[PDB]
Amino acid sequence: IVGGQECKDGECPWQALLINEENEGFCGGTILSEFYILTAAHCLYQAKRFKVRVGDRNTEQEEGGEAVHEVEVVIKHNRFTKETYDFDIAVLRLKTPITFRMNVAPACLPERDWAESTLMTQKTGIVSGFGRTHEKGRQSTRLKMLEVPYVDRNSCKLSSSFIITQNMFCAGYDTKQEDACQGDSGGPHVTRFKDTYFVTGIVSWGEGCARKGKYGIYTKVTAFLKWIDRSMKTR
Template sequence: MCVRISKPFLLTLLLTVVPAPASGPMFLSGETASRVLRRQKRANTGVFEELLEGNLETLLNSSLENNMASLPTTPAGPTSPPAVNISWWMQSDAEVPLRPRLRIVGGDVVIPGEIPWQTALIIRSSGKVFCGGTILSDRWVITAAHCLLEVQGAFYIRAGEHTLNLHEDTEQNYEVLEQHIHPRYNSSISLYNHDIALIYLKSPIAFSTTVRPICIGPRAFTEYLVKEYSPATVSGWGRTRFLGVTAETLQKVQVPFTDQTECKLSSSSRITPFMFCAGYYDEAKDACQGDSGGPHTNSIHATWFLTGIVSWGEECAKEGKYGVYTRMSLYYHWIDYVMGSSGKVLEVDVEEPDP
């Protein structure tokens, strides 16, 4: 269902398809996406021009009546290492870029509850946030694959976090049961190509006004959003400047989509077709060390969709350089399959990008 949250809160989608192990994921099917977007060809154009505002609104209202989650209590934090099952397949097909995108520079402080799908990945031994993640359903979180190399399972997920080192009665800690790294990810070949992973939690997330899942949509819909509804919002607790201190409070920054040709020309490392760039050529606004795995999101009629995953970059907010993100649109079917929402056999683990 799509759930409207009063301003200044964001709006999130809870569209139930065929249930995942505990609860349905937030998928927008190809059929539903077609209803949301009307392809209207104007003179000399061939893009989606007209949006059916009523479709999302109707979907939101009807789903809200049937599926509204009850407000939760906050569970106690994990006290012992979890038993973690890791699905890890290897396939080489890329080169190695420069450095991970652990990051937020030139951003603003997030209002509590404004980005309710944001999670923190926290090292168990130190309590340090090392990466971000995004809630897809009550049992699934999505992040960057390279984040899972840093701790080898010795971490937990925190939802509802806003200001680190300050108890705000909104925090919820969850144990990790399974880690599913994309089958084409191979860190020995490239640390950032196919930089995507899914995390399955031991227990379901308790949704509230500060903890909600985000929407994901099929390829054409997602690629339309990321380009035509730019700028996107990126968030995290990463460094506020290159090699600087990390943020205590969740930060956000808006970054525009960058043409793929410009993206490739700007980088001294290979930009593969499974990545895209966003950011400014000469403006100090970017993600930075500590933001890896976090959400790159675009909104359409106040409904927010995950369109990218913070991956890597060359320093932070450096002139002539852009942030590089995992191209979410190409992994929709893999995500759908791993989360068990469709019940179908996986034919392709990643869609082939445009030439």
Template structure:
């Protein structure tokens, strides 16, 4: 959630690209730092899978807790590759947070010990912008339903009936491999990023915004004029044609979720955009369903929870 050399080049990656002190030269890609635009404060604990990735106590990206076994705990977080591509020293993950300036007893923090970004991640094209993080200790869930995922205590706007409980730490559900989300499906993005393009202040309060999934061809055409290729297998766009609502820098790596039969499903990871909430240029998200076998392989090799 920090400006990088104050330079903005073509693509503004939404999460500063790297923790402070480990950033790539700005010539490769410029990073602007922003957060949820046009959103509202999330109900506390209504995104119980979201984590704040921090370095030296400063938030720089989001992430999501995922289930790794039948045990009600996890030491694995999914985020964007660009968040950790340049290193992850002194990076921690805080779960159960709402106001980062006022931690509560429900907030749990663990250190990131391993970060594996997708082997084909390309920082120039942002293709395959996904990474798996291993924590030094498992974060215990407080889900009221054993084996559950994606349970929320009433996400706003309340488009769907509330799911059980008032949980503070719950894993998000993963989509089926290869699953595609229909255009115009409403999705919810949450994060502690900037609240306007070109802003300096990230939000200490967890914000969320509802955005519709866009038709691939429209998104591809819009970004082609910016010299950016949108690969339908690896990414998708979500936002309004008129702009105004979007994820922004500092939200990078955070979850885009859609309500499914079992709970909220992690369909997207905040990846990049040109500016924030601009008309005709929706936010771009890593398509999680494209990486399910790879994610499971990483979980098997990294997780200490059995």
């Protein structure tokens, strides 16, 4: 996460981290409930066998409320494809149920129409992760959040170099040096409405980090809602 702030105690409770076997956090995720996790459908490639950590805000100083969970099943999206990064979205079912305590709670899943209407028309949104803090840099130790404004879909499509489908949206800044970087994939994008957050995006891809004239591409979560349902009903 280039720029942004630092997630304070129980401030980003829905964050999640997919750690490889060497115990390294490679991607992100979002807690939907005690058994299901929401991630990018393209993070199920950066490893062979991975786990999901929750409750960690600092990767190095064993706080206390951490907890590792094992993946029972992966639900990658049918239509997904690396060639165009369309349908970047998958859901993980954990074996042991996530126990909500401090720094561990789930994010709400909104209704589609109400969401696109009031959540995506909101001014900003929040993205968070343990991702790189400067394109060429080392990953991050602390967990962090960046309030990234929604971008006009046109500009988005103009500023891009790749077809910005209807299953994705832009968010971020044109010049500022603040924009999710490597390692934030699958991470959570939530919108805030009346002190209660709702999942709205999944860190997907981007041309570099915080680049001039380029934005941050997220997966339109509203465009997969129904999918997410029968995905938690298992399928």
